[PDB]
Design a protein around this nucleic acid. Structure first.
Length: 71
RNA sequence: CCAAGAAAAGGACUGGAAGAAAUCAUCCAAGUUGGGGACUAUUUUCUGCCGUAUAGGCAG
């Protein structure tokens, strides 16, 4: 992470959001426009799913209490 | 129905050798403790005979 435009961000977020200043510097450092056009898609895709676990993992903790009249 | 439930830290071991604390010295001067006073009371222990006897032994 780093501070940019007076907020908290990182490299993955600036490229997924299509932040032109970072893309212009990155192409200037030798990246082909076609390589960037593909990465913006794959990089974004990796942050679009699997945000909540499907099952409870067998080594996790579990504790139970009353809530709204039941456990 | 507890950041829930279960749990063997164990086995071994050489701190050693040697040494100089020393020399000197003025606590002094003065000083009012005093005045008054019940251990006996509702006590318990008297009266005699023998014996040279304030010795020693006895009845009531």
């Amino acid at each position: 992470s780093f501070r940019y435009r007076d907020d908290s961000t990182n490299l993955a977020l600036q490229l997924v959001a299509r932040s032109k200043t970072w893309e212009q510097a990155l192409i200037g450092l030798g990246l082909t426009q076609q390589q960037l056009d593909i990465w913006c898609q794959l990089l974004a895709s990796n942050l679009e799913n699997n945000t909540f676990p499907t099952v409870v993992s067998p080594f996790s903790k579990q504790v139970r209490f009353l809530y709204q009249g039941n456990y």
